[PDB]
RNA sequence: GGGAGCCCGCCCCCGGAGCCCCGCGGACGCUACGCCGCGACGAGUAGGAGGGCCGCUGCGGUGAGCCUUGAAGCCUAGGGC
RNA sequence: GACGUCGGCUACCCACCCGACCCGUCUUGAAACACGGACCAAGGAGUCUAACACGUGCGCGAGUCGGGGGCUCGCACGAAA
RNA sequence: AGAGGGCGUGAAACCGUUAAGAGGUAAACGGGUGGGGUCCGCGCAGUCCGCCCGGUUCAACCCGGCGGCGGGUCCGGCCGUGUCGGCGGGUCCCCCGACCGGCGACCGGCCGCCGCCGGGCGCAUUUCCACCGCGGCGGUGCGCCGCGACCGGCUCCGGGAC
């Protein structure tokens, strides 16, 4: 809204809020990212370190599908299954230990972040972390690998 | 869950008949003139032809 | 409630009137014609209104029943008083004070009735 | 035998002369409407002695008599009889001013109603 | 003729909320009256927090509220949060609580009501304890936003761990001259 | 003036539902209806349900 | 219930009246004691002087414990250190006076701002007139006139100062709470010196008004206050 | 509640004690984005911010708005804010 | 004091005393022997799109979203909802 | 045609004419007055009123009717929130019994109060209209003024006493 914009309060002011000693010239400093090495080096080195120079190996035909691998932590693992599944756990005097399919929920790798409740569970996933496997074993479950 | 009164149904010639309806909670929903005005002013810009 | 609708209506009312720094409200049953929370007949559960008589002599007192809202047809009850310019004021005073029906509006309604009665008489030479 | 105000305080004004634009006398294209001088070398802007006076907040009139007519009432612009009845409880301090566009036929009725309600009109005998 | 610097004579603290919603303004009126009448500073703190903007009252998580109520001493006390209470999915055991907040998420509300807890609004809290007796005042992490990760000492400065503004993190967008020891220098 | 000015505005579905619910709720409360200029003095009941 | 409540209210009012009468009596007794103490001090100084002059001896009077300082020049073109000392002495506006107790640090500060101030040793009448005619207290960071002793009692009750007489005594005979009394006292906005000045820009010794004018500061107070 | 004091009993309620405080109900003051009371201060280019019941145009609502018994516009040695 | 007498601060003309150099801009410095300028009327210059950063308001909340498409209408209001 | 064929409204620069005023330091401007005109608001005194007090009917009090407000024994029935119960049909529905919040979510009787209408109430009450009191209160005076007492802020003067 031009009504709420600043230009309405600048009516009558000669310089229109852009100084009068140095006028608002068209492009005093250079267009765009001009002078990354010259006359803007201080800014480019104190606000964008690592802008200039190459590093690493080139990969011509890169595909994100090959490296696609979503991760889920043990911090939020029972959220993938219904709450009644966990209700029917630590009960029945049988040791049901239900199966939670991570791939069905939409993750491939299971990570060890977070605390796991004391309830056995069968975790099926493509990849497992060492700490996540240790947590599952300590809780009393089993890690299952799937393709 | 506020108290919902009973709304009588009026016939074609007034003279409210015996039919009554429990007042829906939509009428007990909170009033927000700011939200109403915001939505109205933003949606009035959708039927505007370019010039 | 009343505060909710007052917050809704304090500035977007059709009866609100600006234009030379005085804000009034023209909705009925509003003593002193003041756009104030206390002086507003639409929002409050108990409202008193003083109006000139349709015939031209006497005054009309309008009371909000509070028995049932959402029914504007029967919400307000009107009574006509045509007495000797002092019994009307006494009747309004007893209506507002003895019934404990919005005592804040007592003197305002008395003044409005006095103004109406003064208006309904021969004007001048 | 007009309508007296409720109170008649002594209206005191700090300044009554209108503020005029700088160099409004020299040129016709410059109106009397005041605009603040915004030049680097301007006597009025920096308040040199003997120049025109720049309006300031100091010239603000007293709140007691602000917007008060010499008669002692405050104007309220009335367009029709329905709007006239609003001033019923404010007749002792507010006066009805009939809108210019109002026809004479309705103006007469407005004047008569205001006379009945004891509300002062600043332009009662205007159209005729 | 007095030398007084008017640079900071005007205090910039808020006086009324900038929001135009009516329920918050009614709560503001109620707590203004309570603060100006009662001698308790709880009402004043609640009024000041109601005046605060959205970013100044971050939401409080259910797990954080649980861990703050589990501290010894605040047993059977009502929790007062001026922000909003949000459900936490990584917590299973939720004891019953007494929570006062402007808003509660649907999931958190369901959890609290299923656990046997009670949820109150600010007007109900004023009716119950006008001076805020038996209340535990809690708030969310102010520095929880990712905005504050970009604040502080600028990147490219020694002993600075500030996240720079990058269009997209990657191999060839940063970690070059200025960050690699093999390319120029590093900080 | 150019044709590709951002004429249209996007509003959240939840916000639109909130606004319409508030409008339906304020359809009650005869004070607001009268203040909106609608003359409902003789209406038997503001939630006017007909057969 | 009604009569019992009325009787209790009357009893409380009577107790308040008796307490106020007792406080008034205490104020009267304190003022009379202060009068006696002032007379004793004035008489004993002359007694010591006469005693010293009786034999081949001299009596050197004590250096004054407090001094009155008035800023005589404006705020335009002031050195940073001079301005800092002036604003530490609560002398911001021209023709403002403030009581300052004298010690090494105070004398050094007054020496630093010597060209910008005129200071001396105020008399008892000068203190009385300054406290009475132009005495304002700082209550809730607000300059409020000392129209009644209630304000002084509320502000300096913890220090044994409950009236104008106690305040004047603590200001004149520098005591333990002189700092608190002087900080409570708002700086005196004295008027322009009637009859003019000799010279603002030069020291008092060389015909000007700036510097130390120990006894003539009383004349300056009479011309300004 | 018990024991008693410089023969016993009351020592009462505002639909009325009549008021410089009445905790029984409470404005002429309450457009609480309102009203009211104290102090201190008021320079200003470049520049920033806030309030405009300042002004122009068109749109959605609203004034049972104005108007051929005279609209906008224009002129004015008239009354004004 | 009341049928040629009253009040009109403001605006019409005139006289007197004091003050008072022509506006905008570059400039440390403008009344300048620095530049633009006879006068008047109309037009006239910080906009829009996209990408960001911060702050504020609203909705939902470890979730959030409508991009695109489809189902309701013959489009008055709708290319809306 | 005060719309007369480039003719609706007809402004400013500029010009001609009528009326008034003025005019040897170019003109013009700000502050303060004075003089003359333009009309404006008064008056053929403007002593502005608004309450209380003194010198044709009904309130007061009853009868009948109607309407309204408040209240509790929750009186009786609905309504309605939290819990307990019939498991009666994870979230969503009915019954009687109990407690609590009895919540402005509604009614039927009861009481108290108020208002209106119709009857009595004929005149020490009642209300109007006008006057002689400037008697009590409040804001005010049509214009020009004068005086008195109190206070605050100042410049002074005459005394006495240490």
Alpha-helical regions (H) of chain D: 81-84, 104-117
Whether the Cβ atoms of residue C48 and residue C94 lie closer than 8 Å to each other? no
Contact C115 D88 (CB under 8 A): yes
**Is D7 near chain C, with CB under 8 Å?**
no
* Chain A residues near residue D38 by CB distance under 8 angstroms: 12-14
Residue A19 has which token pair? 């100084």
Q: What angle do CA C66, C69, C73 make, to 5 degrees?
A: 105
Contact E3 G92 (CB under 8 A): yes
SS (H, E, C) chain E: CCCCCHHHCCCCCCCCCCCCCHHHHHHHHHHHHHHHHCCCHHHHHHHHHHHCCCCCCCCEEHHHHHHHHCCCCCCCCEEEEEEEEECCCCCCCCCCCEEEEEEECHHHHHHHHHCCCEEECHHHHHHHCCCCCCEEEECCCHHHCHHHHHCCCCCCCCCCCCCCCCCCCCCCCCCCCECCCCCCCEC
In this complex, whether G and A touch, counting 3 or more CB pairs under 8 angstroms, is no
Question: What does the alpha-carbon distance between residue G157 and residue F48 come to, in Å, rounded to a whole number?
Answer: 71
Beta bridge partners of E80: E100, E137
| Subunits adjacent to chain D (3 or more Cβ pairs under 8 Å) | A, C
Question: What does the alpha-carbon distance between residue A58 and residue A67 come to, in Å, rounded to a whole number?
Answer: 16
Strand H nucleotides within a 7 Å radius of protein CB atoms: 11-15, 17, 21-23, 25-28, 30-33, 38-42, 45-55, 59-72, 79-81
Whether the Cβ atoms of residue G71 and residue G117 lie closer than 8 Å to each other? yes
How large is the C-alpha radius of gyration of chain G?
22
Q: How far is CA C56 from CA C109, C121, D56, D80, D109, in A?
A: 19, 9, 53, 20, 17
* Chain E residues near residue G71 by CB distance under 8 angstroms: none
Measure, in angstroms, how far nucleotide H57 C1' is from residue A10 CA.
20
Residues 6+ apart with CB under 8 A from F26: B31, B36, C8, F32
Beta bridge partners of G67: G100
F16: distance to nearest CA of chain C, Å? 19
Beta bridge partners of G11: none
Question: What does the alpha-carbon distance between residue D97 and residue D123 come to, in Å, rounded to a whole number?
Answer: 6
* Pairing between β-strand E98-104 and β-strand E78-86 as defined by DSSP bridges: parallel
**Is D92 near chain C, with CB under 8 Å?**
no
In this complex, whether D and B touch, counting 3 or more CB pairs under 8 angstroms, is no
* Chain F residues near residue C70 by CB distance under 8 angstroms: 28, 30, 45-47
Q: Which of C32, C118, C24, C52 is nearest to D77 (CA)?
A: C24
E56 annotated as belonging to a binding site for a ligand: no
C13 nearest nucleotide via C1' and CA: H62
Is any atom of strand H within 7 angstroms of residue D14's beta carbon? no
Question: What does the alpha-carbon distance between residue E139 and residue G92 come to, in Å, rounded to a whole number?
Answer: 45
* Chain F residues near residue C71 by CB distance under 8 angstroms: 44-46
State CA F11 to chain mean position distance.
Answer: 16
Is any atom of strand H within 7 angstroms of residue A20's beta carbon? yes
Which chain B residue's Cα is nearest to F22?
B31
Strand I nucleotides within a 7 Å radius of protein CB atoms: 9-11, 19-20, 22-28, 30-31, 39-41, 46-50, 52-67, 77-81
Alpha-helical regions (H) of F1-51: 13-26, 30-35
Residues 6+ apart with CB under 8 A from G213: G118, G119, G120, G204, G220
Beta bridge partners of B14: B11, B12
D51 nearest nucleotide via C1' and CA: J30
Question: What does the alpha-carbon distance between residue D87 and residue G191 come to, in Å, rounded to a whole number?
Answer: 52
Sheet arrangement for strand C76-81:
C48-52, C59-64, C76-81
E47 CB neighbour count, 10 Å cutoff: 19
Torsion angle defined by CA atoms of residues D34, D37, D42 and D45, in that order, rounded to the nearest 10 degrees = 80
* Chain F residues near residue B34 by CB distance under 8 angstroms: none
Q: Which of G137, G169, G134 is nearest to G155 (CA)?
A: G137
The H-or-E segment that residue D95 falls in is strand D94-98
Question: What does the alpha-carbon distance between residue C34 and residue C32 come to, in Å, rounded to a whole number?
Answer: 5
CA distance between the termini of chain A: 57
Question: What does the alpha-carbon distance between residue C80 and residue C88 come to, in Å, rounded to a whole number?
Answer: 10
* Pairing between β-strand C48-52 and β-strand C59-64 as defined by DSSP bridges: antiparallel
Measure, in angstroms, how far nucleotide I71 C1' is from residue B6 CA.
36
Is any atom of strand H within 7 angstroms of residue F37's beta carbon? yes
DSSP calls for chain C: -HHHHHHHHHHH-SSEE-SSS--EE--SS-GGGB--SSS-TTT-SS-EEEEE-SSSSSEEEEEE--S-SS-HHHHEEEEEE-SSSSHHHHHHHHHHHTTTS-GGGHHHHHHHHHHHHHHSS----
Residue A40 has which token pair? 């803007």
A143 CB neighbour count, 10 Å cutoff: 16
Question: What does the alpha-carbon distance between residue E151 and residue E155 come to, in Å, rounded to a whole number?
Answer: 10
What's the residue count for chain C? 125
Question: What does the alpha-carbon distance between residue D33 and residue D22 come to, in Å, rounded to a whole number?
Answer: 10
Q: What angle do CA E90, E93, E96 make, to 5 degrees?
A: 120
Beta bridge partners of B10: F50
Question: What does the alpha-carbon distance between residue G12 and residue G6 come to, in Å, rounded to a whole number?
Answer: 10
Interhelix angle G149-156/G164-172, rounded to 10 degrees, is: 60
Q: Residue D33, CB half-sphere, CA atoms under 13 Å: how many?
A: 3
Q: Which of E162, E146, E155 is nearest to A50 (CA)?
A: E155
Can you list the positions of beta strands (E) in A6-128?
Answer: 71-73, 99-101, 109-111, 122-125, 127-128
Question: What does the alpha-carbon distance between residue G185 and residue G177 come to, in Å, rounded to a whole number?
Answer: 12
* Chain C residues near residue E25 by CB distance under 8 angstroms: 7
**Is A13 near chain D, with CB under 8 Å?**
yes
Question: What does the alpha-carbon distance between residue G19 and residue G128 come to, in Å, rounded to a whole number?
Answer: 28
Q: Residue A115, CB half-sphere, CA atoms under 13 Å: how many?
A: 8
Nearest to F49 among B9, B29, B39 (CB): B9
In this complex, whether A and E touch, counting 3 or more CB pairs under 8 angstroms, is yes
| Subunits adjacent to chain C (3 or more Cβ pairs under 8 Å) | B, D, E, F
Q: Residue D53, CB half-sphere, CA atoms under 13 Å: how many?
A: 10
Experimental approach: cryo-EM
Question: What does the alpha-carbon distance between residue C115 and residue C92 come to, in Å, rounded to a whole number?
Answer: 14
Nearest to A45 among E92, E156, E175 (CB): E156
Residues 6+ apart with CB under 8 A from E75: none
Residue E17 has which token pair? 């909320």
**SS3 assignment, position F47:** coil
Whether the Cβ atoms of residue A49 and residue E178 lie closer than 8 Å to each other? yes
Can you list the positions of beta strands (E) in chain G?
Answer: 66-71, 96-101, 117-120, 136-139, 142-145, 188-189, 211-212
Whether the Cβ atoms of residue G185 and residue G152 lie closer than 8 Å to each other? no
Question: What does the alpha-carbon distance between residue D58 and residue D15 come to, in Å, rounded to a whole number?
Answer: 10
C86: distance to nearest CA of chain F, Å? 31
The answer for D 21-40 residues in CB contact with A (under 8 A) is 35-36, 38
Kindly report which amino acid residue has its CA closest to the C1' atom of nucleotide I47. F1
Question: What does the alpha-carbon distance between residue E170 and residue E183 come to, in Å, rounded to a whole number?
Answer: 17
Q: Which of C14, C37, C112 is nearest to D85 (CA)?
A: C112
Identify the residues numbered 39 to 58 in chain C whose C-beta atom is closer than 7 Å to any atom of strand H: none
* Chain C residues near residue F26 by CB distance under 8 angstroms: 8
Whether the Cβ atoms of residue E75 and residue E94 lie closer than 8 Å to each other? no
Residues 6+ apart with CB under 8 A from D111: D98, D121, D124, D125
Contact G87 E3 (CB under 8 A): yes
Residue carrying the six token digits 């040793």:
G121
Question: What does the alpha-carbon distance between residue E103 and residue E27 come to, in Å, rounded to a whole number?
Answer: 13
Kindly report which amino acid residue has its CA closest to the C1' atom of nucleotide I10. D16
* Pairing between β-strand C24-25 and β-strand B20-22 as defined by DSSP bridges: unpaired
Contact C4 E25 (CB under 8 A): no
Torsion sign across C-alpha atoms D50, D51, D54, D60: positive
D13 nearest nucleotide via C1' and CA: I9
Interhelix angle E22-37/E41-51, rounded to 10 degrees, is: 150
Which chain D residue's Cα is nearest to C111?
D89
Measure, in angstroms, how far nucleotide J73 C1' is from residue G201 CA.
95
Question: What does the alpha-carbon distance between residue D35 and residue D22 come to, in Å, rounded to a whole number?
Answer: 8
Residue A33 has which token pair? 């990212």
Measure, in angstroms, how far nucleotide J161 C1' is from residue G166 CA.
29
Contact G75 E3 (CB under 8 A): yes
Strand J nucleotides within a 7 Å radius of protein CB atoms: 12-14, 27-32, 43, 46, 48-49, 59, 67-70, 79-82, 90-91, 103-107, 112-117, 126-128, 139-141, 153-156
Question: What does the alpha-carbon distance between residue D82 and residue D96 come to, in Å, rounded to a whole number?
Answer: 12
**Is D4 near chain A, with CB under 8 Å?**
no
Is any atom of strand H within 7 angstroms of residue D102's beta carbon? yes
The answer for F 8-37 residues in CB contact with C (under 8 A) is 26, 28-32, 34-37
B21: distance to nearest CA of chain E, Å? 29
Whether the Cβ atoms of residue C23 and residue F45 lie closer than 8 Å to each other? no
Contact A50 E179 (CB under 8 A): yes
Sheet arrangement for strand A142-145:
A99-101, A122-125, A142-145
F17 nearest nucleotide via C1' and CA: I59
Beta bridge partners of C50: C61
Whether the Cβ atoms of residue F45 and residue C70 lie closer than 8 Å to each other? yes
């Amino acid at each position: 809204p031009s009504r709420l914009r600043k230009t309405r309060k600048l009516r009558g002011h000669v310089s229109h809020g852009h100084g009068r000693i140095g006028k608002h010239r068209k492009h005093p400093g250079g267009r765009g990212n001009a002078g990354g090495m010259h006359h803007h080096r201080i800014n480019f080195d104190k606000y964008h370190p690592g802008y200039f120079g190459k590093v690493g190996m080139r990969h011509y035909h890169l595909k994100r599908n090959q490296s696609f691998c979503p991760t889920v932590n043990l911090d939020k693992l029972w959220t993938l299954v219904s709450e009644q599944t966990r209700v029917n756990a630590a009960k029945n005097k049988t040791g049901a230990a239900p199966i939670i399919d991570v791939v069905r929920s939409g993750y491939y790798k299971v990570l060890g972040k977070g605390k796991l409740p004391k309830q056995p569970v069968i975790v099926k996933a493509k990849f497992f972390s060492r700490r996540a496997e240790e947590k599952i074993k300590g809780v009393g479950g089993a890690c299952v690998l799937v393709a | 869950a506020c108290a919902r009164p009973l709304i009588s149904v009026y016939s074609e010639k007034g003279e409210s008949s015996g039919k009554n309806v429990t007042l829906p909670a939509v009428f007990k929903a909170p009033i927000r003139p700011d939200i109403v005005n915001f939505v109205h002013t933003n949606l009035r810009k959708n039927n505007r032809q370019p010039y | 409630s009343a505060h909710l609708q007052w917050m809704v209506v304090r500035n977007c009312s059709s009866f609100l009137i600006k234009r030379n720094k005085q804000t009034y409200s023209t909705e009925p049953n509003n003593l002193k014609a003041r756009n104030s929370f206390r002086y507003n007949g639409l929002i409050h559960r108990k409202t008193v209104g003083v109006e000139p008589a349709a015939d031209g002599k006497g005054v009309v007192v309008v009371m909000k029943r509070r028995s049932g809202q959402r029914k504007p047809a029967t919400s307000y009850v009107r009574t006509t008083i045509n007495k000797n310019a002092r019994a009307t004021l006494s009747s309004i005073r007893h209506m507002i004070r003895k019934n404990k029906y919005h005592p804040d509006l007592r003197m305002a309604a008395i003044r409005r009735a006095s103004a109406i009665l003064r208006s309904q008489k021969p004007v001048m030479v | 035998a007009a309508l007296r105000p409720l109170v008649k305080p002594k209206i005191v004004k700090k300044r009554t002369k209108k503020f005029i634009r700088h160099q409004s006398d020299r040129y016709v294209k410059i109106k009397r409407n005041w605009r603040k001088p915004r030049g680097i070398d301007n006597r009025v802007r920096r308040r040199f002695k003997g120049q025109i006076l720049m309006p300031n907040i100091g010239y603000g009139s007293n709140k007691k008599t602000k917007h008060m007519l010499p008669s002692g009432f405050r104007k309220f612009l009335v367009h029709n009889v329905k709007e006239l009845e609003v001033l019923l409880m404010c007749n002792k301090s507010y006066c009805a001013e009939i809108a210019h566009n109002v026809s004479s036929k309705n103006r007469k009725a407005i004047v008569e109603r205001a006379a009945q309600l004891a509300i002062r009109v600043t332009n009662p005998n205007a159209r005729l | 003729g007095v030398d007084i610097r008017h640079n900071k004579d005007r205090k910039v603290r808020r006086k009324e909320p900038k929001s135009q919603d009516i329920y918050l303004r009614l709560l503001v009126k109620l707590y203004r009256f309570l603060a100006r009448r009662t001698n308790s500073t709880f009402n004043q703190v609640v009024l000041k927090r109601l005046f605060m903007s959205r970013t100044n009252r971050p939401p409080l998580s259910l797990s954080r509220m649980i861990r703050k109520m589990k501290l010894p001493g605040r047993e059977g006390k009502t929790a007062v949060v001026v922000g909003t209470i949000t459900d936490d999915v990584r917590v299973q055991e939720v004891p019953k609580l007494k929570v006062c907040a402007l808003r509660v998420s649907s999931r958190a509300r369901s959890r609290i009501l299923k656990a046997g807890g009670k949820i109150l609004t600010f007007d109900q809290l004023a009716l119950d304890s006008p001076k805020g007796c038996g209340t535990v005042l809690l708030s969310g992490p102010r520095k929880g936003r990712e905005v504050y990760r970009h604040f502080g000492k600028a990147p490219g400065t020694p002993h600075s761990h500030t996240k720079p503004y990058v269009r997209s993190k990657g191999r060839k967008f940063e970690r070059a001259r200025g960050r690699r020891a093999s390319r120029g220098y590093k900080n | 003036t150019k044709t590709w000015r951002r004429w249209h505005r996007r509003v959240n579905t939840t916000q639109k539902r909130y606004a319409i619910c508030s409008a339906l709720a304020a359809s009650a409360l005869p004070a607001l209806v009268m203040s909106k200029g609608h003359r409902i003095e003789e209406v038997p009941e503001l939630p006017l349900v007909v057969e | 219930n009604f009569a019992e409540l009325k009787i209790k209210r009357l009893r409380k009012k009577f107790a308040q009246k008796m307490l106020r009468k007792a406080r008034r009596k205490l104020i009267y007794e304190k003022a009379k004691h202060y009068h006696k103490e002032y007379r004793q001090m004035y008489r004993t100084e002359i007694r010591m002087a006469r005693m010293a002059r009786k034999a081949g001896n001299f009596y050197v009077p004590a250096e004054p414990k407090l001094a009155f300082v008035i800023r005589i020049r404006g705020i335009n073109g002031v050195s940073p250190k001079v301005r800092k000392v002036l604003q530490l002495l609560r002398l911001r506006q021209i023709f403002n006076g403030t009581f300052v107790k004298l010690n090494k640090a105070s004398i050094n500060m007054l020496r630093i701002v010597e060209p910008y101030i005129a200071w001396g040793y105020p008399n008892l009448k000068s203190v009385n007139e300054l406290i009475y005619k132009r005495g304002y207290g700082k209550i809730n960071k607000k300059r409020i006139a000392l129209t009644d002793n209630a304000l002084i009692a509320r502000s300096l009750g913890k220090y044994g100062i409950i009236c104008m007489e106690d305040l004047i005594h603590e200001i004149y005979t520098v005591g333990k709470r002189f700092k608190e009394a002087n900080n409570f006292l708002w700086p005196f906005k004295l008027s322009s010196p009637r009859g003019g000045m000799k010279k603002k820009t030069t020291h008092f010794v060389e015909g000007e008004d700036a510097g130390n004018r120990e006894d003539q500061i009383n004349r300056l107070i009479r011309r300004m206050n």
